[PDB]
Design an enzyme around this catalytic site. Structure first.
Site, PDB file in Angstrom:
ATOM      1  N   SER A 147       7.336   0.629  -9.690  1.00  0.00           N
ATOM      2  CA  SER A 147       8.332  -0.066  -8.576  1.00  0.00           C
ATOM      3  C   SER A 147       7.735   0.007  -7.071  1.00  0.00           C
ATOM      4  O   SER A 147       6.381  -0.589  -6.934  1.00  0.00           O
ATOM      5  CB  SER A 147      10.120  -0.150  -8.707  1.00  0.00           C
ATOM      6  N   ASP A 255       8.170  -8.988 -15.553  1.00  0.00           N
ATOM      7  CA  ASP A 255       9.577  -8.024 -15.017  1.00  0.00           C
ATOM      8  C   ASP A 255      10.475  -8.120 -14.881  1.00  0.00           C
ATOM      9  O   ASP A 255      10.555  -9.343 -13.853  1.00  0.00           O
ATOM     10  CB  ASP A 255       8.101  -6.832 -14.019  1.00  0.00           C
ATOM     11  N   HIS A 304      10.915  -3.142 -16.518  1.00  0.00           N
ATOM     12  CA  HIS A 304      11.160  -2.885 -15.920  1.00  0.00           C
ATOM     13  C   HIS A 304      10.815  -1.429 -15.335  1.00  0.00           C
ATOM     14  O   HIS A 304      11.820  -0.129 -15.737  1.00  0.00           O
ATOM     15  CB  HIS A 304      12.111  -2.988 -14.511  1.00  0.00           C
TER      16      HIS A 304
END
Ligand SMILES: O=S(=O)(O)OC[C@H]1O[C@@](COS(=O)(=O)O)(O[C@H]2O[C@H](COS(=O)(=O)O)[C@@H](OS(=O)(=O)O)[C@H](OS(=O)(=O)O)[C@H]2OS(=O)(=O)O)[C@@H](OS(=O)(=O)O)[C@@H]1OS(=O)(=O)O
Ligand SMILES: *[C@@H]1O[C@H](CO)[C@@H](O)[C@H](O)[C@H]1NC(C)=O
Ligand SMILES: [Cl-]
Length: 356
Positions: A147, A255, A304
């Site tokens: 991330s 995503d 994610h």
């Protein structure tokens, strides 16, 4: 025991957002010369009001004051061979994200600034302390991240490589693994006014962010854009061509964080056609950006992050798991087995191994 143990930085002037010391978790494996340094993610904040909100809502991402003493490594940080087929025996490092700056901040703050943004300095400080605890004995340092930590890998992997070369450790091969940090600076599904962090369009967030954080980007990327246009280098497909270190890109094609900044929120309500077409186009743009990224793994799933998730071994593209693709990439770097594994099917869950 088999957990990673916390160390706060000896230099307490390198801090989390609130002035508390930054740090790292370490599990040493003295029979190994491989080092995995993982950067944590979890959004960012790009102005005082949103950083004040995040400080009340998510103080853990702004302070070390309540970090636990130890933590268990999972996914690619796990020491169990069943959970981590190729890197289980490596020296494991988890660097918590407490700078809210996509690992880009490189100054001490003013007394007049409320928050300190030091992520790039945190990384450098961690690397220096690791030398005395065995990194001096290393042959590979894989700088991994999910991330915002994934984008942080892209921003920092060459600086870490140049830091170690400059310090007299030329044997260490520095490589990057960027998980869910490959974003498009695209137009939103429906344009918001950037009043909240999560919903601010991606270009604008980073444009504001880089100034608020005094963020630094890699020089070779910076040189390709006009002065003041450094925000470009936070976007993977723009910064990636300039990178000297080998970098493997793991990125879900749909995503969740990318949809969130594009102002799309999938609750299980019926997906209408306008949205359906936006989502399809997003997948296609993302696949296009990966065309000239030979070392990549990009499944057609709505999700994610992945690399420190316990079920990271479950997903496949063209019958190849991610751990196996990462093993092929390593093998390919040892000489000087597919590594380009991008789904071509058009919608979330067209891949049958997608997490649920
Ligand atoms: O337990 S480990 O974390 O150390 O993993 C060992 C495996 O790594 C290789 C590299 O293969 S690859 O990443 O799959 O491409 O070798 C690396 O480590 C060995 C020493 O480990 S071992 O357990 O005694 O085998 C080094 O060999 S040597 O220097 O002692 O001769 C390699 O160093 S070197 O560049 O060849 O000099 C080292 O490679 S690297 O630095 O990681 O790039 C595998 O060995 S290989 O066959 O030479 O490629 C090891 O394979 S294993 O299945 O885990 O046993
Ligand atoms: C500690 O880090 C600060 C902030 O980056 C730096 O200015 C200072 O030189 C460092 N001091 C030591 C003793 O490492
Ligand atoms: Cl200690």
């Amino acid at each position: 025991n088999e957990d990673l143990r916390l160390h706060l930085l000896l230099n307490t002037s390198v801090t989390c957002n609130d002035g508390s010391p930054a740090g790292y978790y370490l599990k040493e494996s003295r029979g190994s010369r491989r080092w995995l340094l993982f950067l944590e993610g979890g959004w960012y904040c790009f102005n005082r009001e949103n950083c004040d909100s995040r400080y009340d809502t998510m103080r853990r991402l702004m302070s070390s004051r309540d970090w636990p003493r130890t933590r268990t490594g999972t996914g690619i940080l796990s020491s169990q061979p069943e959970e981590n087929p190729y890197w289980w025996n490596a020296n494991m490092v988890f660097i918590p994200y407490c700078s809210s700056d996509v690992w880009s901040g490189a100054s001490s703050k003013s007394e007049k600034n409320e928050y300190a943004f030091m992520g790039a300095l945190i990384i450098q400080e961690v690397v220096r302390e690791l030398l005395g605890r065995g990194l001096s004995g290393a042959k590979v340092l894989l700088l991994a991240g999910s991330s915002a930590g994934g984008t942080g890998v892209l921003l920092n992997v060459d600086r870490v490589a140049e830091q170690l070369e400059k310090l007299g450790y030329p044997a260490i091969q520095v490589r990057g693994l960027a998980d869910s940090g490959w974003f498009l600076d695209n137009k939103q599904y429906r344009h918001t006014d950037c009043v909240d962090t999560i919903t601010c369009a991606p270009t604008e967030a980073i444009r504001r962010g880089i100034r608020y954080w005094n963020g630094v980007v890699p020089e070779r990327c910076r040189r390709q854009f006009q002065e003041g246009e450094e925000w470009n280098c936070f976007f993977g497909y723009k910064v990636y061509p300039t990178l000297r270190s080998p970098v493997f890109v793991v990125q879900w094609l749909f995503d969740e964080a990318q949809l969130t900044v594009d102002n799309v929120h999938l609750t299980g309500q019926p997906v209408q056609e306008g949205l359906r077409l936006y989502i399809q186009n997003l997948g296609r743009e993302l696949r296009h950006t990966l065309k000239d990224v030979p070392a990549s793994f990009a499944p057609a799933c709505l999700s994610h992050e992945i690399i420190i998730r316990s079920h990271w071994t479950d997903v496949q593209v063209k019958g190849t798991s991610l751990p196996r693709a990462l093993h092929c990439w390593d093998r390919s770097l040892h000489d000087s087995c597919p590594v380009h594994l991008v789904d071509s099917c058009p919608w979330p869950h067209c891949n049958p191994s997608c997490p649920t």
